Nucleic acid binder design. Sequence first.
DNA 1: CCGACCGCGCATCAGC
DNA 2: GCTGATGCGC
DNA 3: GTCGG
Length: 326
Amino acid sequence: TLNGGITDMLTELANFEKNVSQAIHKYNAYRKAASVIAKYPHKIKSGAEAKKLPGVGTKIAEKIDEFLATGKLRKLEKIRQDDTSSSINFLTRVSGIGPSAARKFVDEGIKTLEDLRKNEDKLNHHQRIGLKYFGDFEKRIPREEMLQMQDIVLNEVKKVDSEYIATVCGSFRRGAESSGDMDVLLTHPSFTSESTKQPKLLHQVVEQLQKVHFITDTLSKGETKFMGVCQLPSKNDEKEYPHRRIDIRLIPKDQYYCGVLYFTGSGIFNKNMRAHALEKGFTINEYTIRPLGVTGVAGEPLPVDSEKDIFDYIQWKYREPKDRSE
DNA sequence: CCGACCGCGCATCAGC
DNA sequence: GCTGATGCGC
DNA sequence: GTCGG
Ligand SMILES: Nc1nc(C[C@H]2C[C@H](O)[C@@H](COP(=O)(O)OP(=O)(O)OP(=O)(O)O)O2)c(NC=O)c(=O)[nH]1
Ligand SMILES: [Ca+2]
Ligand SMILES: [Ca+2]
Ligand SMILES: [Ca+2]
Ligand SMILES: [Cl-]
Ligand SMILES: [Cl-]
Ligand SMILES: [Cl-]
Ligand code: NA
Ligand code: NA
Ligand code: NA
Ligand code: NA
């Protein structure tokens, strides 16, 4: 890509601020700067040319000047050399180990994959499954496999109740040739913003997918969100497929368009769009878009019949899923 | 200069 | 047990 | 770290 070297650098800086510094606003600041540079359609020639972009300020402009002249960033070179930063950045790659847990583990002397595998008793349930599938979870999922996964989920949900609708969102819905994981939005007519006329609507679907050996593990599970692990079936004498992360979100059926907008993303796109919503006097979540009054208190939910209706309210021209890949 | 930074589900824990 | 803060995740 | 006011 045109400015791959710059966007990798800013991403690495973002990950540092998140995992090591625990500086969530600097994490987001670097993430925004990398997103704006990633869509910029010219090979960047200077930090001043970059500073023209929104979210690229003086500090990042200087770093870009250093990177263009030398090919590297001294600040990152020292971060890479530091053992405590390096250890924390490694441990956070395990699902369920965050910045706080990573640092506590480093305090206890647990800081390699080997260390973790000797100390399962110190892990909670989520962290133990994340360690179990550490290698698998870092592999990408070819779109071809995403299509077989889709076919299984949709057909099994059909068997439980023909009135369920399951929609695969995330990067898959944005047209990616490969995805980090599978995200399934679920609706059923018995669950609306007005009533829950049936219990266990999510459980019954999880149960069916466990019964056919598609869902293999559970990281977390409540009434409306499932976070777990799944796996495609393999043929005779073939290696098994990698285990994959799956997220399932049950959304009230009358709030589908807000839900599918949220679950399609991207994450940075959602943040940019929600940040822009507030500037226009609205607040958007996965359920509703609501006006902000004179005091800053959210008003009642505005009518939505389409994804486009949401872009309209905040005066954005509609963007197809494939162009929301910020 | 400085306030504000997207919004929320589930798990875990301290205080009562 | 409950509630609110915090951790971690989407 | 960056931005709007
Ligand atoms: N509002 C908001 N939403 C999200 C997650 C949303 C948007 C994302 O497209 C969707 C699924 O998350 P996931 O991590 O699977 O991302 P996805 O875009 O599918 O990428 P990938 O799986 O890595 O190919 O939930 C965020 N997560 C990360 O940015 C976030 O920070 N803010
Ligand atoms: Ca995904
Ligand atoms: Ca996901
Ligand atoms: Ca495996
Ligand atoms: Cl911060
Ligand atoms: Cl909606
Ligand atoms: Cl709401
Ligand atoms: Na700028
Ligand atoms: Na992690
Ligand atoms: Na072991
Ligand atoms: Na197996």
